[PDB]
Amino acid sequence: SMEMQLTPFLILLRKTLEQLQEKDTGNIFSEPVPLSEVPDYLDHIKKPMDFFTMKQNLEAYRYLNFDDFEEDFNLIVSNCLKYNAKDTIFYRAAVRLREQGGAVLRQARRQAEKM
């Protein structure tokens, strides 16, 4: 709404992003997928995403509502489910992040709604 201030919202997103990174204990979502190792990655995946890129976007003021932020989190998860076979640790790590990160996101969104 018109009363909603920018700085507390960005502080909330920074904390939330840190909490999400903490759930990724393998740090497999911390940086872009190394395209040098998987030249077919972009065959399947239209828009790569990762937590470092999210941090850059956050600080560049690209996220001004919670949907902006959660959309890129969902990309991290969905890209990983799409690219990796179900029988891999990587696939299961996206499932775990969706669950555990989802709880982080729901509480953070509620904070944003109070602003």
Ligand X SMILES: CC(=O)n1cc(-c2c(C)[nH][nH]c2=O)c2ccccc21
Check binding of 10 to ligand X (CB under 6 A).
Answer: no
Integer Cα distance of 32 and 47 in angstroms: 11
Q: Which is nearer to ligand X, 82 or 110 (CB)?
A: 82
Q: Which is nearer to ligand X, 17 or 33 (CB)?
A: 33
Check binding of 31 to ligand X (CB under 6 A).
Answer: yes
Q: How many residues bind ligand X (CB under 6 A)?
A: 11
Contacts (CB under 6 A) with ligand X, residues 65-104? 80, 83-84, 90
Q: Which is nearer to ligand X, 53 or 84 (CB)?
A: 84
Tokens 């997103």 sit on residue: 13
Check binding of 37 to ligand X (CB under 6 A).
Answer: yes
- Residue from 28, 55, 57, 111 binding ligand X (CB under 6 A): 28
